[PDB]
């Protein structure tokens, strides 16, 4: 049905006046990206962007509500890429470190031996250090994606995936998500194959570093299944006609995100599940 229906039964999102739409707090990087994407090969792989609206003295993206076509949708959010922070965060952490006390807490909780003696003394870590740690205990570093959350239309949700890392651990999350619906799994795989094909020919994709975006998997008990790319808040244009392959390893300077390494692995796991 609608994401704000789920929000109410359970941020940056607000109910839209028009049926089938949702509002997201406007950010300049994401507005720029959605405008380019409506004219790109990837047009059909992202939510429709209808422009910006003002609601209580604040700018919102008018987006397609991806849940609108579905009867009580199941949603899985997959964060894509081997790297999940911009390179400029590394520069800022060196010259002008913003110590994050919150990120220290989240880290200790998962692994008490993870922080350094100095981080323990600071009770605080830099964003890049926190994000690099998150990448390594999840599947991000090795597979180039990670499961972030699952939501169901009753309000039922889980974000308990921070140590979901191995190929087989990831497969078991998708296995439980699709609940033996062969039609949903087949439609997901067909959609991911067509998405990969579109990304490989996209003018937008070859010219942009795609960081912190997700693949949103949506299905219902009527066996309807869709997948879309979302969240272009950290997607940045490459300088002066530079391009990425989105598969080669990230080395500070080269701006590689491993997006397609992730997608390749995600397709392989779903193809493996389908043969189980
Ligand atoms: N167009 C959409 N239609 C329906 N639901 C959406 C849409 N965009 C986002 N959502 C929902 O909102 C969640 C958060 O989306 P998104 O990542 O764009 O926002 P965010 O505020 O940057 O969140 P995060 O900090 O987790 O990255 C998604 O996982 C999904 O459940
Ligand atoms: O907004 P801050 O806290 O600076 O960063 C969050 C980070 O706290 C979060 O960690 P957890 O997912 O909570 O472990 C992962 C991302 O949502 C990240 O947001 P960006 O993707 O960088 O915009
Ligand atoms: Mn996001
Ligand atoms: Mn985000």
Curated annotation (Swiss-Prot):
The annotated modulation of its activity is:
Activated by calcium/calmodulin.
- Residue numbers bearing the Phosphoserine modification: 12
The UniProt catalytic activity note for this protein reads: 1D-myo-inositol 1,4,5-trisphosphate + ATP = 1D-myo-inositol 1,3,4,5-tetrakisphosphate + ADP + H(+)
Q: Where does ATP bind?
A: 12, 24, 64-66, 77, 151, 231
- Annotated region Calmodulin-binding: the residues are 102-110
Q: Which GO terms describe its molecular function?
A: ATP binding; calcium/calmodulin-dependent protein kinase activity; calmodulin binding; inositol hexakisphosphate kinase activity; inositol-1,4,5-trisphosphate 3-kinase activity; small GTPase binding
Uppermost EC category: transferase
Its BP terms in the Gene Ontology are: actin cytoskeleton organization; cellular response to calcium ion; dendritic spine maintenance; inositol metabolic process; inositol phosphate biosynthetic process; modification of postsynaptic actin cytoskeleton; phosphatidylinositol phosphate biosynthetic process; positive regulation of dendritic spine morphogenesis
Give compartment(s): Cytoplasm, Cytoskeleton
Consequence when changing residue 231 to A: Loss of kinase activity
What tissue specificity does the UniProt entry give? Expressed in brain.
Protein family (similarity comment): Belongs to the inositol phosphokinase (IPK) family.
Q: What is this protein called?
A: Inositol-trisphosphate 3-kinase A
């Amino acid at each position: 049905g609608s994401h704000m229906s789920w929000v109410q039964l359970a941020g940056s999102f607000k109910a839209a006046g028009t049926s089938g739409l949702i509002l997201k707090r406007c950010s300049e990087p994401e507005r720029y990206c959605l405008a380019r994407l409506m004219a790109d090969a990837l047009r059909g792989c992202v939510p429709a962007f209808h422009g910006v609206v003002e609601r209580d003295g604040e700018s919102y993206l008018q987006l397609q509500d991806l849940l609108d076509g579905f009867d009580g949708p199941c949603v899985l959010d997959c964060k894509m890429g081997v790297r999940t922070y911009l390179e400029e965060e590394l520069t800022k952490a060196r010259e002008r470190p913003k110590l994050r006390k919150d990120m220290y807490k989240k880290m200790l909780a998962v692994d008490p031996e993870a922080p350094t003696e100095e981080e323990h003394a600071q009770r605080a870590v830099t964003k890049p250090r926190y994000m690099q740690w998150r990448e390594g205990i999840s599947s991000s570093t090795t597979l180039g994606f990670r499961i972030e959350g699952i939501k169901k239309a009753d309000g039922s949700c889980s974000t308990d995936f921070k140590t979901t890392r191995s190929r087989e651990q990831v497969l078991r999350v998708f296995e439980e998500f699709v609940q033996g619906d062969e039609e949903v799994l087949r439609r997901y795989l067909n959609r991911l194959q067509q998405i990969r094909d579109t990304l490989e020919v996209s003018e937008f994709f070859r010219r942009h570093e795609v960081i912190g975006s997700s693949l949103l998997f949506v299905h219902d008990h009527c066996h309807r299944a869709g997948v879309w790319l979302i969240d272009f808040g950290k997607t940045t244009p490459l300088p002066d006609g530079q391009i990425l392959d989105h598969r080669r390893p990230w080395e500070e300077g080269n701006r590689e995100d491993g997006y397609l390494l992730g997608l390749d692995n995600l397709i392989g796991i779903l193809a493996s599940l389908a043969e189980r």
